[PDB]
Structures are given as C-alpha cells and as structure tokens.
Write an enzyme that holds these catalytic residues in place. Structure first.
Site, PDB file in Angstrom:
ATOM      1  N   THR A  62      12.041  49.845  66.805  1.00  0.00           N
ATOM      2  CA  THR A  62      12.299  50.926  65.900  1.00  0.00           C
ATOM      3  C   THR A  62      11.493  51.596  64.485  1.00  0.00           C
ATOM      4  OG1 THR A  62      14.189  51.150  65.683  1.00  0.00           O
ATOM      5  CG2 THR A  62      14.146  51.808  67.957  1.00  0.00           C
ATOM      6  N   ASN A  63      11.858  51.221  63.291  1.00  0.00           N
ATOM      7  CA  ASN A  63      11.454  50.966  62.052  1.00  0.00           C
ATOM      8  C   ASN A  63      10.685  49.995  62.123  1.00  0.00           C
ATOM      9  OD1 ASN A  63      14.176  52.113  63.025  1.00  0.00           O
ATOM     10  ND2 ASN A  63      13.139  54.377  62.056  1.00  0.00           N
ATOM     11  N   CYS A  95      18.591  55.444  64.802  1.00  0.00           N
ATOM     12  CA  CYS A  95      19.740  55.150  65.151  1.00  0.00           C
ATOM     13  C   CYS A  95      20.475  56.143  64.387  1.00  0.00           C
ATOM     14  CB  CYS A  95      20.305  54.399  65.065  1.00  0.00           C
ATOM     15  SG  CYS A  95      22.130  52.977  65.389  1.00  0.00           S
ATOM     16  N   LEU A 154      22.184  49.523  57.846  1.00  0.00           N
ATOM     17  CA  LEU A 154      23.831  50.833  57.320  1.00  0.00           C
ATOM     18  C   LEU A 154      24.747  48.908  58.734  1.00  0.00           C
ATOM     19  CD1 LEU A 154      22.852  53.984  59.561  1.00  0.00           C
ATOM     20  CD2 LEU A 154      21.633  53.371  57.098  1.00  0.00           C
ATOM     21  N   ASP A 167      84.146  32.994  28.700  1.00  0.00           N
ATOM     22  CA  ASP A 167      83.375  32.498  29.697  1.00  0.00           C
ATOM     23  C   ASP A 167      83.358  33.822  30.917  1.00  0.00           C
ATOM     24  OD1 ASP A 167      82.061  30.308  30.019  1.00  0.00           O
ATOM     25  OD2 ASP A 167      83.974  29.142  30.515  1.00  0.00           O
ATOM     26  N   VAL A 173      75.334  36.815  29.023  1.00  0.00           N
ATOM     27  CA  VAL A 173      75.792  35.916  29.794  1.00  0.00           C
ATOM     28  C   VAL A 173      76.914  36.455  30.697  1.00  0.00           C
ATOM     29  CG1 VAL A 173      76.137  34.210  28.443  1.00  0.00           C
ATOM     30  CG2 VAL A 173      75.165  33.037  30.171  1.00  0.00           C
ATOM     31  N   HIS A 218      68.966  24.269  24.582  1.00  0.00           N
ATOM     32  CA  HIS A 218      69.998  25.422  25.590  1.00  0.00           C
ATOM     33  C   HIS A 218      70.460  25.270  26.501  1.00  0.00           C
ATOM     34  CE1 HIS A 218      70.980  27.456  21.198  1.00  0.00           C
ATOM     35  NE2 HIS A 218      71.938  27.940  22.021  1.00  0.00           N
TER      36      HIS A 218
END
Ligand code: FE
Ligand code: FE
Lengths: 859, 859, 68, 68
Positions: A112-113, A242, A415, A516, A607, A720
């Site tokens: 087409t193109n 298109c 596209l 605790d 804690v 720790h």
C-alpha cells in the site's frame, strides 16, 4: 540477489559495512541525514508515478503527499536529536548512558505504501547508525528498490560507507524466512501472517498490526466538521492507508442531519440489492478481494454490477448486525463505508468495542464530540476503548501519522498496536526504538545520620530545674508517670510528684510494669492513658520502664497499630516495608533513668516479650526517640552491686559494638572511645564503694548516656543478637548475658579471612582487627603487630569482669547441660533471625553461631 | 495441572479473573501490593531453607538475603509509581497518556533463584493489574509453588480476584510450549535454549542472556578494594547467581600485589596439574557440568581429584589462551575463577572484548580504576565494551541487580541484554515494561504569524527625507544601486544619486537586469558587490529588478549557497528541510519600487527564472524581507498604459488569492478587502487619464502595497502556479498571464463537493463559495443565494479586463494550437509541481489542471 | 536530622515531598555561588519534586542589616 | 514576529533556543497573576531548555515609579 548464497554474501557485506559505520561522529551522521533528506525530498513525483504505474491502485497526488511527508516531516523531527554518545549525565550519582546502535535491521515493506515506507525506514536507520536490508513486496519491487537507491547513492556521496542499504531484487518465501532469522532485528509492516512469521522466528521483532477503525458521532458535535473529516480521511489515497474509518456510528439525534450532509457532498447510499451485491463483491470465501483495494467507488460499483455517477466519492450501506458474520463489519481497504444507528452513547460504545475487539484490536478509534461540555462521555470513551491511538475530532488517516493535525505525537508510519494486537510496541515507531542504551554505574555510598533527642539535661540535681520548664515554657496540664513496682514502693517518684504538685499539674501514676515487659502490661497502660488522656508522659526507671512506656505511647497515639508488623526485619532502615506512624500528636515522652547500662533515654529501640510465644521482639525506628531526656545522678545513687556491675558491662558492650559497627562514623567513634575510657576507669570504684562515691556514679551515668547515643546512631553487632536469646531462654540479666559473650565475639570479628562479609558499600575490606587495636591503644594497653593489642584488650575485659563479680562461663550460672543441648538448635535459629545480625561487620552462619554458643558454655 | 485440558481450563479462568482485576483503582492496587510484599517479606528463612533442601545447591544465608532483597527493595522502588490512569498530561496540546494492563503473562523460573525470582515477578505482576503463569523448573518446582501460594493467599485476602496467579504442577516441554503460545507476553529467565523458544513462539517476549563477565584491574587502582570486591562478588551464593565475575585481567605492574592479596584473603592458586584436572572436570562433552554448579571450592577440588584446605574460598587458575579452545574462557556458576595478565591497557581492552563476545555478549563487565586521574581510560572502556551494564569499582554480583552499591539503577532480578544478547530490553526489566501506553490526541490548529518589514514609508516626496536616515541614525558610507537598463538610461536614479552625493556616501550602480532576470546576471552582480565591498544595497525598479537584487544580496553575503537547494518544495514553511542562512550583517537592504502592482518590496518571494532551462523558480523565505520599504508616488507616474494594466491586474489577483487562501488569517482579510476595493474603484481612472491624475496613481500604488503585505502573510493559490508557467513558456507579461486564468480558478475553487481538499487543520470544510460571496458583498454587486454573487463578481472582473485592454482568450495572443497541444503535457506537469499550489483550498489534480487550462485557451 | 556523606543532597531533599509535604521554598545564597551555578543541583531537585522556589542572592561578606 | 492562534506559546518560545540561543530570562508579571500561577507554563517551558529565569511580581495596578 535472488539466491541464498548471494543473500548470505550480501549479509556479510552489510555487517562489514555496519561495523565501520557504527563509529561515526555526530557531524558526519548529521551530514548524511541532511543529504539523504534532500535526495528523498527532491524526487517525490517520479517515485509516486512509478509506484502508481507499477502497483495498479491508488492516486498519484496523495502518493506525492505521502512521499513529501516521509522525508520532510521525518527530517524535522530528529534533525537535532542527540544519539551518538553520552545522552544523560548525572554527576551526583554514578549514572551515565551511551545510547549505542543496534545492528542489522530486516525491513518488511507492504504494497500500500511502497516508496514512503522505504524512505522513512531508510532515513531512520541512517540516523541511528544502523544497516538495513529491505525485502519488497512482489507486486511493488521496482518502486521500493528505486527509492532505496535514491537514498543510498546520496548517503554514500555524503561520506558514508558503501553497502549500508541492501535489498532483495526477487523476493520469495524462503528468502524472507532466511533474512528474518539472520538479522539482528526485524522491522515488519504488512498486516498479519508476515508479522506472525516475524515474531515466530527467534529474533526481536517490531511489527505492525492493522484492522478496523470505528468513528463515533454523537449529538453534541459539529456535523459538518465530522462528516467532512470522515470523507477526507476515507477518500485520502483511495483508502489503502491503514487506520481509515471502516465504519461510522451516529446517534439518532442527528442521524437525518448527518445523512443529509453526506448526501450533499458527493456520496451514494445503497439500497437493499446494492448492499447485497457489495457484500458479495467485497469478500470472497471469507477473505478480502484483491481487485477492490485501491480503486475508486465507480470501479467498485462496476465490478459489483450496478452504475453510479462518475463524481461519487463514497458508497454507504446501512447495517445493523455487528457480528463477525456481517460482511460490512470487516476491514475494507476501499472507499466503501458502513453506517450504524445507536440509541444512546452506551449502545455506541458497546458497538464500537465489538468492532475493535473483533477486528482492529488495539489499532485506533475516533470520536467526534464537544470537548468542553462533555467531559464524562470523553472520559468514558478514553477508558473503554482498548486502542493505542484515541483520536478526537480528527481524521483517522492523517491522525494516525500525527504531525499534521496534532503535534507532540511521533510522525511515523509503522504504527505498533501493543500487546492487544500481538506486537510489543504500543507506540509510533521512531528513532528511540532503534537504539541500545548502556548504563555506566560508579560506586556510591549510603548517607548516614546523627539523630539525638533534643534538650538533653545533664548534671546532679537538675531534675527540678528541668521539670520547671514543663509550665513556664510548654504549658502542660496532665501527666502520666510510668514506673515499676519495686521502684514505686520505695518512693523514688516522690520528687517528681512533689514538683508536679508545686507547679500545679494533675498527675497519674501507673506502676504495674514487671521485668521482661509483656503485651498485657502495655495494653493495660495504654487503656489507662486512653481513659485519662494525659498531655505529657514521664517514663522513670531502667530498661523495662522505658520500653514499656514507649509501647504504651505507641498504642495510645495509634490504637490500630499491629505489633507483629513493627516486629519485622529490614535490610535498610530507610527502605523498610512498614512505616511507623508519626508520634508526638498527643503527649511528650520525658525519660528519667534510674540505672546506667540501658541507654534507653537516647535510643529509638524498644523490646517486649509476647506472653504466649515467650520470645523477645526488638523493634527500632526514630519515631521512638524520647524528647527531653533528663539524666540525673541523684535518682540512681543507691543501686545494688549486681545491678551496677551488669549495667556497667552492658554499657561497655554497647560502646564496643557501636565502635566496630559497619555504620560507624567519626561522630559515633569519638563518643564510643570516650565511653569506653570512662567505663574502664570508674566502674570498679562504683561497684566496690557505692553511694559513698558520687563522682564515680556520675561518671558512670555520663558514660552510659554517651554509649547510648553512640549505639543509637550506629547500630549494634552480633553479641546482642545472641545475648538477647540467651537472656530470654534462661532468665539472665542483660548485662550478665552480654558479659559471657563479648570475648568470643571479639575474636570472631577479628579475622583477616572471614567466611562472609557484611555487604555494606562503606565497608570495603575487613578492618575490625585495626579498630580493636585502636581501642586498645586509646585505653593505654601495650602490644605489637595489632594482634597482641587485641589479646591484651581481651585480657583487660576478663580482668574487669572478674573485679565486678561476674562468673566465667555459662555453666557457672546453674544451667543443665541436657537442657542446653536440647534448646541449642532453636536458640541458634532464633539468634540468626535477629535485627542486630545485619549490621555486624562479619556475616555469621548458623554453625558459627552454634560454635560460639558451645565455646561460651564450655569455656 | 498435569494434562492439556486442565491447562486450557486454568488459562480460561485466569483470563476471566484478569478481566475483573484490570478495572481496579490505585488504592486497591496499593493495598494488595503492600499486603503481598509484607507476606513475602516475613517468610524468607523457611523459603530459603526449602530452596536449599530441594535444589541441593547454594547456601541458606545468601538465599535469605536474596529473598529479603526481592521482597523489600521491589516495594521500596515501585510503591510510589503511578500505573493506573493519566500518566503524562499536556493541556496546551491534546496529548494524554494512559497506562493500561498488559494481559496474561507466562513466566519461567530457573533453579538459580527458585523463590526470589518468583516473588519478584509475582509482585510486579500484581502491581500492574496483570495475571501470571509460573512455569517452575522440574528440579525446583516445590519451592516456587510455595512462594507463589504465599503471595497469592495474601493477595486474595487483600481483596483481589481468586484466580490471579496460576502455576503448572508438573512441567514438561509440551506444556511449557503450549503455555508460551497462548499467553500475551512471555517472561523468560531460564537461560538459553528456552529464551530462543520464547522468542520463536509467535508472541511478544521478554528474555535474558547471560555469560562471562570480564573484570579489569589496572595500575591506578586500590588493590585491596578490588580484590575484596571480587572475592565478595564471586563468593556470594557460591557464584551461582549470574552477572558474577568469570575472569579477571590484571595489568603487568600490579600482578604481584594482586596475587599476594588473593593468597592472603584465602584463595588457592592451582598449578599446571591442578589446572588440567579442574578444566577437565568443569566441562563435559562441551557442556557445563550439572554437578558443579553452586558447590563449594572444596567440593569442586574433591570431584576434580585432589584436596585443598577446608577454608579455601576461590580456586584461581592462571591462563593465557583466550580462544574458545581454552576451557577457562567459558561461563561457570561456581567459585572457580580464571586470571589473565596484560602488558598494557590496550591489550587488556582487546582481551576483555574477546571474552564478552562468544560469552556474555551484552550482559555486564567490571573495571577497577582511579576515576579522578585516569579520565581517558574510563572513556575508552565505556566506548569499547558492548555490555548493557558497565560497573566501575563495584562488585559484579550485587552491581548487576544494582540498588545496593549504586542508585538510580533498577533493582531487578531479570536482566535484559538488548539486541546484542538476542532479546529486546537492553535494561533491567522494571514496572514500565509491563504496561501499555494509550495516547489520546485532540485536534490542534497550526500556529500562524504576521510579519512585515520595518520602516514602511508612505507619502509623496518622501525619498530625500527618508534617505536622510543614512548618516543620521546609521553610519553607512557605501551604496550599491541595482536597477534596470531602461530606468538607468532615462536617468531615473538621478534623484537618488544626487541625494547620496549630497551626503558623504560613495555609490556604485549595476544596470544589467533584464526582464525575467537570469541567474548569470545575479552572479555577476554578486561578484561586482564582492569586488566593491558595499555597506547598503538599494534596489530600484520593478518586480524583476527587486527580485534579482534580492538574489544578488543572497549570493553576495553567503557566497557558498546552492541555488537548487533554495528552490525546493516544502509542505510547511516552518518545517523546511533547507534552512536559509541568517543575513543581516554585511549589507542593509532598501527597496524603491517604480512599477506598482508587483508589490515585491514587502514580500519574501524572489521568483527568478533559470539560466539554461528557463524555468521559473519561486523561492520564498522570510529571511528575504526588504527592511525599510519606501513607497514614493512621484516616481510612479511615467508608466505606459500596458504596464499599468498588467500591474493592476496582478495586484488584483494577489489580493484575491490572499483573501481566498487556506492560510488566510483575519489579520490579512482586511488588507485584502481594502486592496480589492481600491483596485476596482481606481484602476480605470489611472489607465485612461494617465499621469495627469496623480490621485489615481497614488491610490493604485497604495493598493498594490497593501495587497503585497496581504499575500506576503498569506500564500497564493493555483492561479499563480499556472501564470508563472504561462509567462515562462510563451513570454507573455506576468499581469496578462494572471489575467487570463482568474475566472477559471474562481469557478474551480467555488465548489461544494470537490474531489480533493486542501488538508489544513483549520480548513475543516469547503468555505470558498462563502468567501467569494463576502468579496462580492463588500465590493457591492448585491446578488442572491451566494451563487449569483460569484457570477456577478466574475462578470465584473471580465468588465474590468475589458476596460484595461486585456484580450479575452489566450488564442487572441497569437499562440499556435499544435505547439500548444504538444507542450500542454509538460506544462501541466510543471504547473502541478509548484510552491503556490500547496496552499490552494482545492488541491487541483493534473487532469483538472489540463481541463481548466484548455478551457482558458479555448474560451 | 543531621545528614552526612557525599551524594546525600537529593536523597535528603526528597523528604521535603515524600515525608513533610512543603510547597514553597526560599533559597538564600551569595552572589558568587549563584553566579557560578552552585544552586542548580538544589533547584533541579525542587523542580523535579514539583515545588515552587525563589532565590535571594543579595548578601555580601560581613552582612549588614539592610540585606536582612 | 507577531504570533497568532491557540497553543502557540511553547512553539513561539522554541525560537529562544533553536534560533536565538538566549540563556537568561526575566519574567515581569503581576502579583494577582503570579499568585494563581499564570507564569507556570512559561517557567515549565523555559525549564525544558537550558534557560535560567528570574521572576519579578512586585507590580501593582497603576504602576508607580518605585516599582519600575
Ligand atoms: Fe542492650
Ligand atoms: Fe504575481
């Protein structure tokens, strides 16, 4: 090039030419682009005439327009777009991008193109320093080859390599399949079948989809504008381009006016027989006819079997069915058009969606509406249409290739229809799709911080003067003191209550905090705060008091917070999943310690132990910093000897871990060194004498606070992480648990060949031995070669532990061996999964932790 | 899922659930993402243990680190991104970008990261409202299914559709190949042999390559930093993770120090026998051993046939061969490493470029260098390496997925390689690769303008007082007068020559300008000025003289210009391929007209004929405006009757085409109407009375200048595109050439249903009949229904032509018919290819041009 | 909130939007720094975040009360 | 260079860099207009190019000489 071996030789030549081309500078590529643009623009009519004569369909003038577009608008979209070298440069970070070329492109051109697509692809390939091979359609070989030649003999003359652009003279199926598999990328146009084969090849493919394009016309639109734009786009180049309007949907409100406007300007509405003949002539055996594309309406009518005036432009046949069986619902590349009647906007949207999903799924659609007073309808159209292009009040043929009717849209053919149509573009293929971007990354370090609570007050007897600020400055009215039972029963909260009474402040005291701290006590405290609604919070006591009061503060200010979410482990404190809510909306958090070795008045740590699971959950965020921490030596002059020893050893461990941390900096280093020196110089005096020595007590206070600051800013280590579990499993004081593990942790960290490393950018190579040697040198010890210094440090720590009456091994604290050996596997697992583990300068494994446990137990 | 039918059932249910999930809001997506991230974050240890138990390779702690990274850094990166609706919005234009989900994804998972990759992919699929199929490896399926279930339960609990995440219970080649062919997009991470199938599956795919990662260490580098970074990167998860170093190239001058550091930090160097055993046990039958990946160095040494100390970390072999024959140049996911020696940086670059190719082509590379002093070497390394990730002073294992050592780098576990690696990403796959971007475009109108020359002087006898501006506000001391031979002979430059001589300016004159000026005369004038070195250029005479002087000015001030490039057809004047050079520095242009109707002293047109083919090229650019356009009536008196008639008709045509033009803005319509009224009311009086009626001549000159501005701002139509060729083919005067075609153009433009439109954003429908009716109403013919007014205007124009002595038809100008019909085809072809036909409202075709021009020749 | 180490300016300034939520900024600097474009790294981040800013650069050595 | 038609502000401002090459811009506006943000498109456009701008909005209706 009509045989396989010739194609392979051509491909080798193309690669050899592209290798030379891929090193050109910006000026050279600019010159090639400019000269190629002139060459393509000058020969615009001859190419159009050649294409229309060879192909047998289309109109010369619109082909001339397309040929002029594909050169002029392409040149003036990328004429000054940088694509050679460094395009992005961020000096603050290490990022830099290079934007290198891509390689070899296999171009598939439709019929087409023929010429415009070839010119566009060749120009965009030339701009990006690529090499392109063009495979023309069998019906339109000569025009495409001629366009490629016109571009090529100008690019070469401008100063470019010889064989940049190649083409296949005689195209075949096997040749196309071979060239698709042997090329770096496949740029494909020409509808389905060829794009399906291009994507089913094994190489990256940028393909084009195609299909229907519905155009909605509703009540509130310019009828003349919509009708004439549709006519213009449909009749442009006989409709081979298109995205053309293959259907129209018009509401009943302006149906008759739209029909009259179409009739006024050269259109023909088919009757029942003409519609049937057109249906039978468009489609043959469920496929599009090849003799109907590109011709005028008169020729289509002649092939159909009736006659129309020679001046007619469009043939319209009214249809109601929108299913796949209807022959007017397919995409026709001819001036034939189909008209639909819709009751309301929702029906029009339903029909348009059906046309899009059945046919052109993801290509484009058009709407003609007033964009000022119909915002909701426009938004519904934008939401419901699954097409990469949504055009409003624009002809579709010239709107898809958008530089004419709307700017800031990429001017290009090819596209991409997105994942809806089956290709990974979802945009207009342009220059940026033909480049490879390389990222250069330099080594960068995380930022650090120095965050401490404001208004730290430090002397003897400063508590009344500090608390006097609560009225003359802030102006509070209600106070909620939190302490522990033993501390409350002996009247250590008397001065605070007396000062509050003198100032005239209502106060309430909660003292049911046990050692605790658990969740039940925190919940009860939070309930009392909710019932009392205090304006300030005063947390008086040691480790349990501050942690419990912090948890009560959190639950009081935000009663919807889940505790199991704050107790989650994170790699970076600033990148954690859970963010703490902002604090300070209701009350202050003045803190007054009655011991030394917790540092809780200056740290964001808390804690607590769950009642059921019975395991401690350390949590940390800088939203827990107690503003206005008061450190008075009068409140903590009469502590017992064991508590004093445990607190001093805990403070010493805090300072050591803060010093040998990965996050250690000068700010924390100076404080850690001073704290270590003070703890080593004054702890025995405080232990052996007691309240009779106030200077030692005050010095220990200051050292404990300084160590607290130091390990608040720089986190702790691995001692720790296992000390917490040791203390929780067998109910030992925290300082006692720290004392039993510091010596082996020091030797574990001091290693020139660690099994793993802490993976922190600031920590390049192991250095813990040198840091320990620096600590030993600062203390005043003697040694050589940085090893005897660390050994002397360990000996000094042993001496200090011996002086303050702390035993040597875990077994000396009456713990059964069978119990230890049956709980060790769980204790190691819990110790590894701890917050403090990730900051240690030597990443521990489970077996190493178990070995450290065994060495601590057996001595 | 173990059968095909179950697989289609699962795919159908997943599509159904995705159709529901795709319509969620930002808040719901954020909620689901956060809940899934937390659920995956708090289950790292069990997942790592399961992965290690199942795969039988890797180390638990590094898998824990990987799980934590993949569950926390993903959230920290993509929590604040927008992936729901309008992303970018530009209200000035019509652009609106909308993010839409991608569809159903089919992802494959390797055994290197059985769980972390699954977590990362599931999270990024949940963020983008997508659905995912996980295809677990047959060797590590259970852990992948467990991680998928962990994320899915939290996702569905957070308020997501039930069937979002699917998985295959028992994988097989048939099941994976069927899954790949049905999903919209494929996410391939399973290595080569599967990525190739994914790309040759027929659907869009996103795959990854992998291979050898060269590392360069040169003279100006930190030895300790480089060695420790290499050791950390290589030992992380036993080198099983990709993007890790496979070979190191060390410059000659630092080889000893690097070897000593490697030996010190716990690496074992192999000798010739050990190298032979290792290289024989690495690759079996040209393939990587399946029992060596992920194992420790000790296990590899034991399998090779010797023993190493239990604490050895990396087995290093020194080699020389780089070709594929050497078995240490291959990729290996194990702690075995290869060391190379180079004598110069260029040799190191050459070696590294051979190792990236044939291995990790486009993946990553590393360089350790001082980036402050050695700036050139960094540029050379960046240019030479064909890898998508270039790391400087960074470990490769953590830098490939870099968010740990470098920022502004995407934290992804899947690493694209670009066209080099046979895939299509060329970046770390993020959240932006799983989205479709729809563009909504509104119809915008072209930007217009209104440009006129400065200092336009309008009154009789203004020439001396205006020329007083020289040496008054400027300092011009040299003048170059351009005129015609006829005007020079009759002493028409005397009023200017006297005035210049009165002041202190020397002048030189050029009088070789024939009617229809040739390019040779322009070149001669340019050479004369170049020899003379003037300061100002005074162009006196008719249109031909002024246009020739403009061309001489262009060639004088920019002697490198190419004429054929200037006379080049463009669609938009602002999007010219060829840009006229800036011209205001060497000369100052003044235009003094003696003929009236030409109006070239206010226009950018400089139409001239060719020197060889005699073709009229109308080159026009706004750089040609003749500033200081002076109009003096007293110089306009001695024009004979024919010249006055031709000039008047030319000005009338200029005004008519300016009014009817497609680019005609409102700023020009007033001028066009005023000029038309003036020309209609005063042309016969000037034509008959002659110089005895100064008022008529002054009004005619003023009308000519007004129409000149009008058509300077708005371009012409097809009548000039025909008249130029008519005057160039048969040597007729310009005015009479325009006179014979105006009626045909008026009848052509006035048509409610034309075959073609002008393709302009604001010319949305045919309006030409209304414009001509407005012209008729303003001039005062007083017709009816917008059609009789056009006929009245045509009759009035014919009467005006009669009154000025313009013959009715071209045949009356003594033109042979046979030669006419022989040259008609070429003349039509040239007429279509003109600059003026671009702005015509109708866009005439070639057959219509031929028919109209035959009508004008026959009557 | 004392922030140290190199390359911390954009990361620290990110808190202006992602934590606090400010909307207007008033930069104060000297003639030399503003002329040599040393405020550009800050204004670039402010523009990226979407914060309006205005710069006052009319301070001198040993500043006086008039400038204040 | 009189420029007409809607949406022509950024297209016209393109000429400052591509054709003219200016570097420094001084916007003069009104307090009422500045407060509502009528200079936002202009400053956004000038930021897309390498142009530094300074805004002066201390202009009142019936402008006195002091503001000048
Ligand atoms: Fe502690
Ligand atoms: Fe003319």
């Amino acid at each position: 090039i009509d045989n396989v071996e010739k194609l392979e030789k051509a491909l080798k030549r193309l690669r050899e030419a592209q290798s030379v081309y891929a090193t050109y500078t910006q000026e050279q590529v600019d010159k090639i682009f400019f000269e190629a643009a002139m060459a393509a623009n000058k020969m615009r009519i001859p190419l159009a005439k050649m294409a229309v004569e060879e192909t047998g369909m289309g109109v010369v003038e619109d082909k001339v327009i397309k040929n002029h577009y594909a050169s002029e608008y392409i040149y003036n979209a990328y004429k000054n777009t940088k694509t050679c070298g460094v395009i992005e440069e961020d000096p603050a970070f290490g990022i830099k991008k290079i934007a290198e070329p891509l390689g070899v492109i296999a171009a598939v051109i439709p019929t087409t193109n023929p010429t415009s697509t070839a010119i566009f692809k060749t120009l965009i390939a030339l701009k990006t320093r690529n090499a392109i091979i063009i495979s023309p359609h069998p019906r339109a070989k000569n025009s495409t080859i001629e366009a490629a030649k016109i571009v090529l003999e100008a690019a070469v003359k401008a100063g470019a390599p010889e064989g940049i652009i190649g083409w296949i003279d005689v195209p075949s199926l096997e040749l196309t399949n071979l060239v698709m598999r042997e090329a770096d990328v496949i740029l494909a146009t020409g509808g389905p079948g060829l794009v399906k084969a291009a994507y089913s090849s094994g190489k990256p493919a940028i393909g084009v989809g195609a299909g229907n394009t519905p155009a909605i016309i509703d009540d509130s639109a310019d009828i003349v504008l919509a009708v004439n734009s549709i006519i213009h786009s449909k009749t442009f180049d006989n409709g081979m381009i298109c995205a053309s309007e293959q259907s129209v949907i018009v509401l009943d409100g302006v149906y008759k006016e739209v029909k009259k406007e179409f009739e006024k300007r050269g259109c023909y509405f088919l009757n029942e027989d003409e519609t049937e003949k057109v249906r039978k002539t468009i489609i043959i055996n469920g496929a599009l006819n090849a003799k109907i594309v590109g011709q005028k309406a008169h020729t289509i009518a002649n092939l159909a079997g009736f006659e129309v005036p020679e001046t007619t432009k469009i043939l319209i046949g009214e249809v109601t069915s929108v299913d796949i069986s209807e022959e007017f619902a397919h995409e026709k590349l001819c001036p034939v058009l189909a008209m639909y009647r819709a009751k309301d906007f929702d029906d029009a949207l339903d029909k348009a969606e059906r046309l899009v999903a059945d046919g052109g799924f993801g290509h484009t659609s058009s709407l003609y509406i007033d964009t000022v007073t119909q915002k909701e309808k426009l938004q519904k159209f934008s939401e419901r249409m699954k097409t990469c292009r949504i055009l409003v009040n624009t002809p579709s043929s010239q709107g898809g290739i958008g530089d004419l009717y709307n700017f800031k849209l990429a001017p290009s053919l090819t596209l991409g229809c997105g994942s809806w149509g089956g290709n990974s573009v979802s945009d207009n293929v342009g220059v940026k799709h033909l480049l490879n971007i390389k990222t250069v990354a330099e080594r960068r370090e995380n930022m650090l911080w120095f965050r401490t609570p404001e208004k730290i007050y430090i002397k003897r007897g400063c508590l009344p003067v500090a608390l006097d600020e609560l009225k003359n400055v802030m102006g509070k009215k209600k106070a909620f003191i939190v302490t522990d039972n033993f501390l409350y029963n002996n009247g250590y909260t008397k001065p605070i209550t007396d000062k509050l009474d003198e100032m005239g402040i209502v106060h309430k005291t909660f003292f049911d905090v046990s050692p605790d701290p658990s969740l039940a006590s925190a919940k009860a405290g939070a309930a009392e705060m909710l019932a009392f609604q205090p304006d300030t919070i005063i947390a008086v006591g040691g480790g349990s008091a501050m942690d419990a009061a912090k948890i009560m503060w959190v639950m009081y200010e935000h009663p919807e917070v889940d505790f199991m979410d704050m107790a989650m482990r994170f790699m970076d404190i600033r990148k954690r999943v859970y963010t703490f809510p902002k604090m300070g909306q209701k009350a202050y958090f003045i803190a007054i310690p009655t011991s030394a070795g917790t540092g809780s008045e200056v740290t964001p740590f808390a804690v607590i132990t769950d009642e059921k699971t019975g395991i401690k959950y350390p949590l940390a965020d800088y939203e827990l910093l107690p503003d206005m921490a008061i450190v008075d030596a009068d409140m903590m002059m009469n502590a017992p000897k064991g508590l004093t020893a445990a607190s001093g050893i805990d403070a010493l461990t805090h300072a050591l871990e803060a010093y040998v941390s990965m996050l250690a900096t000068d700010y924390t280093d100076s404080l850690a060194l001073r704290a270590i020196k003070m703890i080593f110089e004054y702890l025995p005096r405080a232990y052996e004498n007691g309240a009779s020595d106030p200077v030692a007590r005050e010095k220990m206070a200051n050292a404990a606070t300084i160590a607290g600051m130091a390990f608040a800013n720089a986190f702790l280590g691995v001692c720790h992480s296992m000390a917490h579990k040791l203390g929780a499993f067998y109910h030992l004081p925290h300082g006692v648990a720290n004392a039993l593990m510091i010596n082996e942790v020091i030797r574990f960290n001091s290693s020139e060949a660690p099994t793993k490393m802490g993976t922190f950018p600031q920590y390049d190579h192991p250095r813990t031995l040198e840091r320990y040697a620096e600590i030993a040198d600062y203390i005043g010890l003697k040694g050589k070669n940085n090893e005897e210094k660390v050994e002397n440090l360990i000996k000094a720590i042993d001496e200090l532990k011996e002086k303050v009456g702390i035993r040597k091994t875990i077994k000396d604290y009456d713990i059964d061996e069978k119990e230890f050996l049956d709980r060790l596997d769980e204790m190691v697992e819990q110790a590894f999964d701890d917050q403090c583990t990730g900051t240690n300068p030597r990443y521990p494994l489970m077996n190493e932790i178990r070995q450290m446990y065994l060495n601590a137990y057996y001595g």
